[PDB]
Amino acid sequence: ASRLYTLVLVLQPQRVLLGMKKRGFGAGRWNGFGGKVQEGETIEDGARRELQEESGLTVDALHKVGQIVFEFVGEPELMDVHVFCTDSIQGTPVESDEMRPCWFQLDQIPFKDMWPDDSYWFPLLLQKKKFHGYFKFQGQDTILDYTLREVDTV
Ligand SMILES: Nc1nc2ncccc2[nH]1
Fold first, then answer.
1. Whether the Cβ atoms of residue 89 and residue 57 lie closer than 8 Å to each other
2. Distance 153 CA to ligand 1 centre (A)
3. Residue 17: which CATH number?
4. How far apart are CA 129 and CA 9, in angstroms?
5. Does 31 sit in the ligand 1 pocket, CB within 6 Å?
6. Range of the domain at 118
7. Which H helix or E strand runs over 126?
8. What percent of the residues of the chain are helix, what percent strand, and what percent coil, each to the nearest 5?
9. Closest atom of ligand 1 to CA, residue 32
10. Are 149 and 67 in contact (CB under 8 A)?
11. How many domains does the chain contain in total?
């Protein structure tokens, strides 16, 4: 009972791009760029597509850095989120009716205004570590339990 999603982080040596979602699931929080994987499309092709649709950027090189499963108590579907980091990008981030992009210095990540799980696995992403995670949520603000382990292969 799971559904595939992608999440792409545009990470450069001194800064990371995040986008403030203006409506829908997760509105009001800074996040990477992603969404559901479609029929007939590979997970990586979906990550590339979602980055363009949501940020206006075109990614050359992409690589997998994590997989995180989210459970929301009372909701049947688990979110199976495949996390990617960019290595090269083209274009300028585009503000739209759906998303407001901003670059953040690496020591100024706005964790108070992000999903609470990001405080756990973003430090790994920043240090170029790969990870498998699982977070059980009650509502959208409370982590009931979690597991997070570094791995060599996502
Ligand atoms: N970055 C990020 N964290 C999340 N936690 C739960 C659901 C979606 C999420 N996107």
1. yes
2. 21
3. 3.90.79.10
4. 14
5. yes
6. 1-154
7. helix 118-126
8. 20, 45, 35
9. 1
10. no
11. 1
